[PDB]
Symmetry: C4
Subunit: 196 residues, 4 copies
Amino acid sequence: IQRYVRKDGKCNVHHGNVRAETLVFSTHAVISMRDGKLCLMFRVGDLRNSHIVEASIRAKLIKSKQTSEGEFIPLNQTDINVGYYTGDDRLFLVSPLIISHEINQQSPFWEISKAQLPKEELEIVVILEGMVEATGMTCQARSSYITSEILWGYRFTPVLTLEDGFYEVDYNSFHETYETSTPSLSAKELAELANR
Amino acid sequence: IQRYVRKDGKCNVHHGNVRAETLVFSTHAVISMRDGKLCLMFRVGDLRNSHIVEASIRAKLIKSKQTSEGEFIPLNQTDINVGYYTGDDRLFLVSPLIISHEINQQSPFWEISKAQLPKEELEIVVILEGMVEATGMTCQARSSYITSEILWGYRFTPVLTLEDGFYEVDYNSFHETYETSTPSLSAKELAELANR
Amino acid sequence: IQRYVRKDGKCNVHHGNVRAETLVFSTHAVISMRDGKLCLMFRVGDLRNSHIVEASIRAKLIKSKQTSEGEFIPLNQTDINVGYYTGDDRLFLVSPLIISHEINQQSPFWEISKAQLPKEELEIVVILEGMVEATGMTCQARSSYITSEILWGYRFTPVLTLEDGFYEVDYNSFHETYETSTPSLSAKELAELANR
Amino acid sequence: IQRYVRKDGKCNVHHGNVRAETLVFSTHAVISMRDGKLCLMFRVGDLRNSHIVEASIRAKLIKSKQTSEGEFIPLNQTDINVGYYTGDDRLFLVSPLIISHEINQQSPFWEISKAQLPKEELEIVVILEGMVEATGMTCQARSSYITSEILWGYRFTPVLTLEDGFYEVDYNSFHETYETSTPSLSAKELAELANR
Ligand SMILES: [Gd]
């Protein structure tokens, strides 16, 4: 068993680094099951040459809506749960991580099947905030997924490998994703069906 | 479908901007239904020429009170719920947003009807905090609504329009509000009545 | 009705101020009822000549303890609830405020009667954190209440008065407290008795 | 009774200090009962010569896993509860503290017995964040515990003593731990057995 983090706090990732370069989000989002729950996942890279302290991830849903009373909200915002309640939105970013939003009853995607997906007019804004260790200053990094950039029935390729007592990142695989067996029923629809 | 936010994080709002100017709150507050819930809403503008990171909204109620035991608290403070529990108080401020407080059992306005409104001696302090991207420094912006500045039975005019692959803000409409059909019963009173 | 806070964010407190001086906590703590709940309250002053942004209050209990298994924890720490769950620990500090901890089942003082109070070896550490608007830097302010500095059956003198469209603070009254009718039963004991 | 913290905020620890030196975590972790709950505890030192404001502790579990659907997550991360929900993760660090994670149903260690412990391939990353009072800048401090560094059936030696109206820290005892009677059943196993 080779440590990820040494007793003195220095991580064993990217041999010969020195812990402007900019942080990258995966180009696409995926949906698929993880332990019997349907999930939306995107990937968020690290900064090769420094840590980010008080690092956090949050996501917004951008979708125009009409209230039952006829009020039309263009490009209305609602928060997507990505670990807020358990502090899993508080990141230890020292190699790319797959961020996962479990699609449950409170999730905006609860009623959205595979066929239904591409008819929906929506946008996911991902926002990482944190302090660059060296620089001292507070950073923000943003990206966006529209409908056609969400792939149903996919998983992220792993990028991480153990070489010579250090962990190296295959950055070529970063945006790579592969297909996996996945129901085309909406989360809701799955819950209903499982409940009999 | 035209993106709000590009893959590289740059937003498609205010053509030809450069992302001191000061942030503006709407002059008035409104109350009206949204999906069968009574809501208090005020509007909070963006900063045309920069982002605000770790941006957050909170609101206080300023109202003198006497405790059952006779203790008189002048200008006593209590927090108004504006998304604390779901992280919706964590703002992605890149164009003016209507902030909404759902008037539920825990809300200070639960027992306040339309006729009752203007007899009440109270004040809503709105406070936005966040870090100005460029400047580096932590900002605070404050405003205030007293009773006569809360309009019952109103909605905010939309200010947002899509022009030429960019979203532009009609700042003239910012404080503009329009009337809408709205019960004059207090939230409580509505809950009671609906519960039979 | 005279506003506390003007539409432009400037508060109407301390005529002719300019919004090092140090923040003051009340010298004593009090316990007494507020709306049928027993409460521990201390007071925390403002900074006459500047705001504090992202201002927050928290409190620790310092008390040595033995675990059921015989482990002795000298000067063990536990958090005292002072608004954490409702965001009432997030302060709008523009004049001294009475901070209140409701003594409920989860509170360390739940089983502590008046006679029992002075036999207990304990300490309350109060800690205010926040950013000084002008200065730019993050401040911390600390104080401490030991047993003999907690007054059972008392209330804080009000310090706030309206003079000439401005609110002025009588700083002489700051640490002043007065006696009030108050049961000598522990919170627990009160709950039990009320539950029949 | 000798105060820990004086009325003016200055603590009575380390006679003759001046409130780079680096913060130390205990070299080992321990597991044992505290009030009938099984707990994982590690110790985290203070900075002899300055305070840390907005100080916080969080911990991650690093463990590779396969999802029921066959997805393999190398070095997958999940948050370990160390006071998040009660604000006990918000530290008042003015002398070394034993941080405790109660091993409950939601804890990753719930099903892990003593014999089972050393067969498990896992890592605990501890991360303290906070602002150095003097310096002005945001610090992060990290350390790591792998399986062999977690001692089952142990407790931390106390390091704290009262000498001459001041509290002094025996830093020699810092990583010292002693053995204590402790079941070898997993937390789960204990819950089951107690539930009859
Ligand atoms: Gd901060």
